Write a protein that binds this DNA or RNA. Sequence first.
RNA 1: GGCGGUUUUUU
Lengths: 54, 47, 28, 258, 115, 84, 59, 463, 49, 59, 446, 66, 38, 50
Amino acid sequence: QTVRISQGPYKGYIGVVKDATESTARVELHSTCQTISVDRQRLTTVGSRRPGGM
Amino acid sequence: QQPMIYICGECHTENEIKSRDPIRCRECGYRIMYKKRTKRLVVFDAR
Amino acid sequence: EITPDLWQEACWIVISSYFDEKGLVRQQ
Amino acid sequence: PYANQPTVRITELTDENVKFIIENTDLAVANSIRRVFIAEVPIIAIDWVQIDANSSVLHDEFIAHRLGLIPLTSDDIVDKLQYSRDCTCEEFCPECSVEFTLDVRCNEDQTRHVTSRDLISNSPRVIPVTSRQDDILIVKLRKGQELRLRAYAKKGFGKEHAKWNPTAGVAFEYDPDNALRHTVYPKPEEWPKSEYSELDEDESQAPYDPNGKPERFYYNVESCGSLRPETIVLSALSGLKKKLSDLQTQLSHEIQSD
Amino acid sequence: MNAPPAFESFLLFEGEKKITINKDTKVPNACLFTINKEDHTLGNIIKSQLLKDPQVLFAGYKVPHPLEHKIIIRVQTTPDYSPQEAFTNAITDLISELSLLEERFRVAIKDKQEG
Amino acid sequence: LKEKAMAEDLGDQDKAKQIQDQLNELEERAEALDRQRTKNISAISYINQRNREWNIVESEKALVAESHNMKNQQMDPFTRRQCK
Amino acid sequence: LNGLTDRDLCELNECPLDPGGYFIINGSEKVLIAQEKMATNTVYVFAKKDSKYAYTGEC
Amino acid sequence: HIDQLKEREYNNYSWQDLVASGVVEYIDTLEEETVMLAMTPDDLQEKEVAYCSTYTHCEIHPSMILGVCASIIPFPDHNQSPRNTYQSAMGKQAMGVYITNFHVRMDTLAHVLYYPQKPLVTTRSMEYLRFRELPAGINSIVAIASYTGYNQEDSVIMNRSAVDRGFFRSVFYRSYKEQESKKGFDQEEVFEKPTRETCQGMRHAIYDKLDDDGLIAPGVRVSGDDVIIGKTVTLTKRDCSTFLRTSETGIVDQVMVTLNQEGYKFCKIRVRSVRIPQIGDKFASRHGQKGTCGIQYRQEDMPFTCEGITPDIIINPHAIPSRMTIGHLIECLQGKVSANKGEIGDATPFNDAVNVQKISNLLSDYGYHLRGNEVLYNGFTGRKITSQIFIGPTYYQRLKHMVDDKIHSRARGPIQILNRQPMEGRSRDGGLRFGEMERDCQIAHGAAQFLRERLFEASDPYQ
Amino acid sequence: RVRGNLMGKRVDFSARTVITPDPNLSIDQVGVPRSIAANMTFAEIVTPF
Amino acid sequence: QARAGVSQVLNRLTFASTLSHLRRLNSPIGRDGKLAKPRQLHNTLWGMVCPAETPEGHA
Amino acid sequence: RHMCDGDIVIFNRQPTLHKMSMMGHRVRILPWSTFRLNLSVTTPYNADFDGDEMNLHLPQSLETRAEIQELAMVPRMIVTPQSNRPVMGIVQDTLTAVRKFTKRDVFLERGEVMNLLMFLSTWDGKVPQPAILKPRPLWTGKQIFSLIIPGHINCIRTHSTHPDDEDSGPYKHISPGDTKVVVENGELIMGILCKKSLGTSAGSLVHISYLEMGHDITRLFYSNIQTVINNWLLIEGHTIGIGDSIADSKTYQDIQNTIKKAKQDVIEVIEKAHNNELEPTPGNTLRQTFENQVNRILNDARDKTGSSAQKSLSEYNNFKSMVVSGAKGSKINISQVIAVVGQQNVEGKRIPFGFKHRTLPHFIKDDYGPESRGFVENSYLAGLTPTEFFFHAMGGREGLIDTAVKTAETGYIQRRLIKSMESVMVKYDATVRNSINQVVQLRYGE
Amino acid sequence: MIIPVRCFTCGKIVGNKWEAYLGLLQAEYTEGDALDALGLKRYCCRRMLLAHVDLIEKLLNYAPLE
Amino acid sequence: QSLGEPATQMTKNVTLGVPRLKELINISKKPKTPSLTV
Amino acid sequence: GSYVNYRHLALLCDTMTCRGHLMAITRHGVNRQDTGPLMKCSFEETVDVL
RNA sequence: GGCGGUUUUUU
Ligand SMILES: [Mg+2]
Ligand SMILES: [Zn+2]
Ligand SMILES: [Zn+2]
Ligand SMILES: [Zn+2]
């Protein structure tokens, strides 16, 4: 699922959670070509649905 | 309800191609067609 | 008339014409 | 066993660059102020771009790169806005960021020149250098292409990225006449005279001065367009003072804990 | 792929101390101050200020590694003068000098602006 | 396709019609290109042509000036072979 | 693209700078390297010493 | 003929006219041995010692002997022949706009530079080689010096601020093709998302990243070991799809779908990745001065002249004498002169009118040292450098030899089938080969335990 | 076999990358990256120590 | 039994590489020969072959 | 556990030519993604930092780790048994930097001295007495370098630009040119440092340090030398460009006169050979002796021009500085750059007549003149003629082919040499034997 | 492909000067004069206009639709 | 290794270098440049 | 001008002149010694010596 | 869980 870093030095970046755990979680940064490991509480799901479908 | 939309090669018109169907444009009739940009949150860091 | 001295510029007009008439892959 | 009493004298004040001279100071302090001008200088600049549709010919990251390089004035907004990293909220709050929107589409036959003027900013003062001289060309669109995006500019300094580098070209020179011999000319007669050289046209360089210290540092700070030059100097001095104050506070706490 | 981010050159990490003191055992009245997340800007000036102070026998800053954001300032004063207070007074006088310079620059600018 | 059809067809009327259609298509394409390149795309070519002309005349004046200023040529970093 | 205008070359998703002169087999651009050999119908004379012949004329 | 040819284009005069008039003649290698060829017309025909006085032909321009990649070298005669050859070989590896219609191509491996500038000093031959329109480099302010120490054995020190602004920034494209086909009477492939139920053979990676059609949409993030296509083969289904190679990481650019010659669905997907110049990247000028970015300093740390002009690159002065590449120094001096003047200079190999003294005389008419040397300042402390560094513009390139494309590691990766030993190749996630030479080196050291551990423990244990 | 897979094998725990100068490091030190450090692993016995 | 490498894949890495590969030659001599007379630049390759552009490996 | 700082790895370059090519290293992690290493550890590997590739292996056992740490290690493998001399020496810009730093006219202020002392891992913490107390405390480059020499090392070395006719005459123990390095009690007294004192040579300063002090002491020595001299070079500065390639006009006149004399001499030799006067030198035929005389005349002319150029150089010249330091360059390179390149021989002889009795179509038949056969009269600084340019290309091609064949043959040679004696070893009986216990030497190395 | 936004060396804004440069060169000013007319003292910034290649034109020639 | 390392660096008639090294390593019945120093 | 310790040369000469006759360093000189097949195949003539 | 060959490049 797509998330958004709400706190910390990477505040603003968007990424998809690759590997999640009970505390930390690995997120791949959309801009930079590197995957980081940020705490789960620091993330905020933004999602990407598609209302309508008609 | 996503019939998967494609863009023709030379005509640049939108086409609805479902599974088990030929890959051709609704008009003229070509065998090339690209996809459309995703709907995800394409966000960049002007860095 | 012969072109004394003043030739460093005329020397490349012929090369330009040759390359415009014949491309780089003209042999192939 | 204390500091010194430096003096300042401006020689040229303009809306594009400022030339001044600092006397009775140390070469280390002069160089520190210069490096602070070049890097540690708060300033606003595009940082978080979001593109919804880009059918242009360039890349999708090319647009973000160009938007980040585009300057943005911040004469009285950078001192008010806080770093997005130190913000106490979620999502780019207007209290710590400025918003910009771009929505262009080439309909006519002639090609479009998406310039910086298309960046409609939500704030009045935070806008690209287009007030008072063409605009910054982002990209060129041909009939049938478009570009829709929204960006957020935050506060930062050159130490993080070159976008927050207000000073275009800081020219720093001390001791025009090689008097202190900090630079040995194999053939002094073959070198020109500095702009600030008081020596006559006969002698090549001033003689040697053993009991001579580097003084009279000439600065020529040229602003890119965001912050005025004098504003850059003042902001740099304030930033250097704040760094020293934080270091002193940390040292006092460390000494008290030991 | 392993490029470090751009905020690790000034932002402090959870647990790292800004300044650390370590007394040396080779000579008396000698202390090394390790400052984290700093560069030559916040080091050359302090070295120069410590040099001006006559009671400081030795004062010099170094960077263990360019990629590593850290500096070490070794100081050595007279036996009747400690390096802690030496550093404190150096920073204080330097701050006062910068403030005086800023005030003078501001007044010079306001005078140059039609005056 | 029109050119291939014209080359394949031997009828004089068909060939003339194909040639007219091809000419009309080429004229329309040229008009569209001109309308699209009236700015920038044409100014760049104009500046390029005038700049190459200016460069040619610059080279010619430099050559004639070098031929005129034939007083003396005493230089150090230069030489040429001289057999026999 | 035999003597075609740069206009049509661009319309056909091609550039006028492409030197051309390369095949397209299975979608890959194949280029033939010019091989060299001894000119035929010419009589050469060699003196191979690591043999029983002192001189040898080849054609 | 010169005037009728100069007034060409507008009318209809070409090389065929000269060939017909009988001013030029095609001489072959076998006939060239029986003609008294001349170099220049004026020099070799006045009236000196009777050397021959029976010239039959005359070359157009001597420099014409050069080829394609050797032509772009400015002042090639001012360098050693080995460095010219090295440069002709590296010029083919330079990045930039390899073709104007690159957005339509779907080739594998393609590097496109963002701001490919034109050489400030162009030879009169590249005008026809077409290098000015599609360059492969940027003119950088290079300062030959040993600033810190990270540029002492064929290495450079780039400017971090310049890289940020967009100094030698490039994008790398990687294409992936996949076509479905009839393997057998019962076997058959189809593009479809392999779910977690019906598909037996499946990889432990993400699959919902792609759409229902099975093809990943454009402008989507992708990392190593991420599904790019949804190919499933019915045995119920085995996931026979392809995944982005490991250590790739990029963003999808476009997706193409069509019918191959056989008539089956064939798709091509190219993912782009913006390669920011980091240390380890290989660079090289037009003279064989190859190098790798050792360390990158910011503008505040890099030195600076009397004005705000920090070097973008700092080569190793020690790389000059041994290699004898004075053409590079001449190029830097002439580039400084051209940038101060306002026009591209000439770097033709044989010209008889481009010496160093005249270029130095012109440069001295702009406030700079006639020889190009300038006074810098220690960017750190701000003190003048006793030695006046030699700084000036110079054209640099960027080779495709990236550091990310060569880095590799291993920790009990896949094993072959014939001899249960590690694989080979970075793509196959293989281990390095411990050669017989390494065996001999270890024998000399006397580390039999280490030797056995390498040739058995960490190779192929078996009982 | 005798020269391809007996006297010359391919070993694990091996990395290969370009090299760059670094005078700050001692002659015995080697500056390795972080990716390779995280990929490779050294086995260590557990001891109350 | 036939030759190898007569048809190569056009290296489309840059415009110079494309042109060079289109105008490239190749000798049929065996790879890595003990002799050294055919690799040396002959005087006759004046204006016919680039005296500098050439690989640096075994070929 | 992942590789942490301090682990012991074995670093290698693919072509392991000798023992000193796979030594242990202590791991240190850094941000970017590139292997790194001190420049002094570049001579053994023979790397170049121009896009090279080096392998890194990690053992998997405390046994093997300790074995590598005690045997195969950088500081322990400083001297090699093939030539009993160091293999890791200061052979980079630090060498030229220390040469200019150790000159007699090098004076430093307290600030610079205390800044350089910061980069000394073996500093006792006491500031040395300045060589010049009044009128202002000024240290000396040699005085600061003395602290870098560990222990009480004693050695004597000769500097590159040391006139041989000096030890005989006066000023033996007091050289005017500041030569004759005489270190006592680990303190530099006289002379300037160069490759003869710091490079890889028998009896060099580093060699004496390794033989006297320990391997760890020598390691610290290398680290301190580099780390102090680079920081001082930050202030000194070193460059290269046209300002150093240009001569002094009179040098050009001397070079032109020498070239004209050489041309006249070769023309006279040709005239003598045509008129039949040059008698055949013993052991050689007429053509052989003619070619020998022409070659000797050209070599003498080239040497004279080069010596004139060298004598014309200035002390501030960067080429001469690097050459005298020995870091990179040579007198022949400076000559070929400024004065004249020289002859372009092929196969140990002059440029042959590819065409019918002539080199190129331009030159006329039977033209054994210098310029016609390949003598490059110009220099890399003043451009080259197309004929000599093509000829220089022929010479470069010959060199590349030679390097390729050498690399192809020496490989098989070394393979055979190793397979012949891979089993020989010294036994505990103090005797060398092979795998069959056959005595090869009652005592190793006799 | 497109004029940069700033100079790699200095940092002065230059993207807003390509059109003015073309116009000044087309009027009558030479490059050496149009450069200092726009205001580019440092030679590090003049290269951004003397050497910049404009390939965006060729790129647009391949119009997608119409 | 000690005799092979300098082999990689080394190059009336003597034919010194790699050829002479190979001839001495391979005891042949006919060398390339036989000669006696009487 | 290079230098090599005399020990390496003496060891090589002794290995060549140990068995009286001048054993050649090539296969034909090394595979004749009674060392063993596992070592002879390691060098050359693998299948033959096996 | 996938092979052989060729070519091209790099130290
Ligand atoms: Mg190398
Ligand atoms: Zn259709
Ligand atoms: Zn906020
Ligand atoms: Zn600039």
